[PDB]
Symmetry: D3
Subunit: 232 residues, 6 copies
């Protein structure tokens, strides 16, 4: 009766993330890594490992999949952002990804990660140039009052999905200049499904300051109808 | 002051039921233009279902499964962690009564303020308020008659509740059923999940008659096996 | 067989051990021809049809449901039971030229009536749902129902064979349905909510 | 007077990158009208990808595979066979550079005319003119450092180019990757393709970790097993 | 064993296959004589390659039955006295057109053109009303030496080489009102890969040629490539 | 009910679409496709996929007889006779059908087509050559007809095909031919020889 010798963690803590912030390359269970060429037709055509979140960057985990990466690439090339703000850092993968990418395009960009819990961050202390971390909860806006003068243009991204609309109002009133993005990843389609009448009303409240950018907005399952930018 | 839309994940934005309102078509299509009528549903299909004017979050396939399960087991108690609007509570009571079964339905939740069942229709339904994370929410329960079906719809602290139920509640043949979450937990944490479930190998089995019979019950229908 | 028998698993044990959870097969374990039921009687109405009928019953609150085509009576017991628990005073009536196959015992036979044969006597209370489940001679019965039976609001419903009639003879189907343009309409809240009632839910208009 | 439209098969009509254009919707959509906004990409998806303003014919899925492979292998050499606009060359040289890998990137093509890489942005990238019909092209690969990834993206004389790579170029753990074409060679020449591949059974295995990970690499990632 | 071979250029087989002769596909993972007790547990899948499995009289047919059904209608309606095919290969299509016009009682000459007739598998026994010409498509002389043809006429492009110049020729020197010029296969690919130039080139013939809408959406292979003289 | 063939007519779009508006043309079929297939101006209730399976079958088997329960307007019969004739096979095509009237096939096109009137064989059916294909296209009394053919008609190698009604217990003297069973939706699991 192994269960009574056992206490059980709560598995909800792994929703959208997984058991480990550390990256580990996948592993073939039911087949050799080296399939021989005489039997090439008989090889299995499926992936061989879980496609839940297999993506990485320089040995850090990456929760933004390749289609998303192509959109952010295009968006960086066009906008040439002076600042990027990730909300929800997790393991640090996409922070390093944004900083490395702006560096290669020759863009002088400051990458800023905010989070509840930076203990999960996996970025070498040496590989941290042009990056700044901030512990703080989205749930209360002082996390954003406290930080200051960011250069523009500016991309603000919500991967945390918490207090999102109050943060969006904070951003329009106190941060975003014309042409700056505010991107809500993953979540906007679910909120519409679960709460159509409230979701539409909330989005609509921003009818005069934010518009959805139809050039990037339909270009990845993750950014799906979530890519917004400042007007007026 | 924007409400936090996460609150509504899996539930909806209003516990009260309202019938679908057609938006780009009249209710009455003229038969001379029968073929040109749009063949799609017409409404939002997120949780369209009802039972006597109360919302139903269990879709029709799931309901078919429970009908069969109730018919075979003939449970004398049904317990639901997660009550919400009460739809499924009243359904269970209503169905067991139609089948002639003497069944108490008990419902447990940390917030009962959303319940929509009129007290005139509360016969054989017992609501208790508690948090899954406190185990006393369960130790406070009075003796229950068997067979019994324990259903997790709240998904918090689920495995320690399984440990509790195996040890203090379930007689052989009784069901501990986890709706919806098993496939997600397995996707997000495949190893931990496997080890956890497997730790119940001696006391619970997966019932294959039902475990593949509905999208919501999928791989979550479990029963107390002989010691 | 009209009698109901639970599904039997030929390739799986019913009790799959938890230590091998991931290895369990994901398909249903048996045929999905007609595995539905209601209190030990067979139900040919799949769960989506059940839901539409539930909804229909709840808003209309029918005084009379008439089922042309009975088979074994499970749908008849379902209508009666469901109308009882909603509080609706409803008379289920079931008409088939052959009734031998009917499994309902004479005890829970309250508010149910069987007639055998074609055409007759309706001093029956409205609102009414008429369900054509005997897929022969349909458009004739539809004219017959509009001339003798149907009042405003009342439904006439064609299960199963509607999309098949547009498949085989499309020109005639449309003409034959378009002949009732002035009397019946297609209720678009239910007419797309089930494969079995798909585009077969009609109701008297005026 | 009409050009041979077959020339553009797989490539496109201009090797320079032109950003996509929205055919029938404004770029800004009013947020009060969000539910009504269209849902499909909004332009042609044939080959809309890019790296630093140059076209990339490797899509994001292929890009992710190569990243993984490059992180693990840490190749001292990558040889693209068939160049076109040079997008891949620029990309590989960049990805290795960020990754702290000291990597040479060689492009080989009969036609280097359509290469769009500026001369300023050309460190660790060398280009060689030459035909796959003839093997002295590859013979002057001046024993570049290892490990090495060799990729076929032109597809002429490909099986002879492989017998050569095995005997004179490749070492244990080096890659030989045929993009796009292997599933087409198997559809069309089931018998012959299956003989030719497999004639290399003692010298090359298919690496299953990367071999089913994108459409373009599908059943095409091979490596030297000595 | 790799050193002990010289490999053919497998591109040679693009859209053709490796063998002009028809070989009937055989089952691999199962016998052909399944038992009737096990009728339920027999699989739904075809059981073979599905690439270009079709045939006519022991000759490989590269036009799939869907495309074949629409030519049957087109021949029946128009009743052509001449059918030109560019791209012959095994001669399957040639013999099919010939056999179908004949069974339909039409006096139709089929004419097949190709740079390489070595691959043709039609017995001479069954060569009636078939005229082959060897010539390269990117070479207007190939067409200039074509004798007079009776009308109506259906001209079909299966070689897809120098195609637009050939339409220009066909429009200037062959096609009378009613006649068809039909590009099979290539058109969708040409619109994925060169949408600007393809649109420009087609609109060049706007005044002389039209997309026949009764046939052009009707098979995968003819999809958007069926055209005729206004 | 219409046994005669009529070519589909368009509705919303012209037949002649301009090539300067080529990219904008409608990509859908433009008309219903219940069964708009003909052979030589006669309707025909074979998909092109079914047409191709039978073709392969006639070419391999080379039947000296084809029987066909249900005829309708005669397409199949003419088609079969024409196909065996083009293939040089000496085949007789028998069409059996209770309502013979529908048959549009004209007298001058009947060589190797014999029609018999009747309901589902039972007499007025004489000795015929093999190999034989037998086709049930009229799905009443289909199973008694199987045993009867199995006991009085089918020799080894001969087929018996059920056409349309086979998704909706004979292992000793029959078998399912797996080369053609899956190859078309209309013959889904209906192709059974010996
Ligand atoms: N209320 C809250 N306030 C701040 N951070 C929160 C939060 N709720 C969740 N989070 C954080 O949100 C993160 C989501 S994962 C972040 C994904 C990452 N930006 C990438 O794309 O690679 C977690 O690290 C979690 O700790
Ligand atoms: N820790 C916790 N303890 C008790 N209930 C909780 C909880 N966390 C969430 N819940 C409750 O879980 C419920 C689950 S939704 C219930 C589903 C519905 N009654 C059905 O039968 O299908 C919500 O009402 C929520 O209030
Ligand atoms: N016989 C041959 N010898 C050398 N190069 C050839 C060749 N045939 C075709 N090519 C070249 O092959 C190239 C194919 S496109 C190259 C694809 C691109 N490098 C990518 O990353 O996907 C063309 O540039 C063409 O010039
Ligand atoms: N330029 C050219 N001139 C004449 N024939 C050519 C040609 N290019 C290719 N062909 C020949 O014509 C055929 C065209 S390629 C094969 C076409 C095939 N029927 C299809 O549509 O997919 C081959 O038989 C080839 O030998
Ligand atoms: N029970 C029965 N006895 C004899 N004929 C029948 C029959 N049931 C249906 N039929 C006839 O069989 C025909 C079936 S339709 C036959 C279609 C034919 N194979 C084709 O492709 O063209 C109809 O003409 C109908 O009149």
């Amino acid at each position: 009766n192994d269960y009574s010798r056992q206490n059980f963690q709560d598995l909800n803590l792994f929703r959208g993330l997984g058991e480990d912030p550390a990256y580990h390359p996948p592993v073939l269970t039911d087949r050799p890594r080296d399939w021989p060429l005489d039997r090439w037709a008989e090889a299995p055509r499926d992936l061989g490992y879980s496609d839940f979140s297999p993506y990485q960057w320089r040995g850090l985990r990456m929760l933004k999949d390749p289609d998303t990466q192509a959109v952010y690439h295009d968006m960086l090339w066009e906008l040439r952002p002076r600042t990027i703000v990730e909300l929800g850092v997790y393991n640090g993968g996409s922070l390093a990804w944004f900083r490395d990418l702006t560096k290669i395009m020759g863009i002088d960009c400051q990458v800023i990660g905010i989070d509840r819990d930076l203990s999960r961050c996996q970025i070498p202390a040496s590989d941290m140039e042009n990056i700044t971390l901030h512990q703080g909860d989205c749930s209360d806006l002082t996390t954003f009052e406290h930080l200051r003068e960011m250069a523009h243009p500016l991309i603000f991204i919500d991967n945390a999905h918490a207090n999102t609309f109050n943060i969006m109002k904070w951003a329009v009133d106190h941060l975003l200049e014309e042409g700056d993005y505010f991107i809500i990843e993953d979540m906007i389609p679910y909120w519409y499904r679960y709460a159509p009448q409230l979701f539409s009303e909330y989005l609509g409240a921003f009818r005069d300051v934010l518009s959805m950018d139809m050039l990037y907005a339909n270009a990845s399952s993750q950014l799906d109808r979530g890519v917004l930018r400042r007007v007026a």
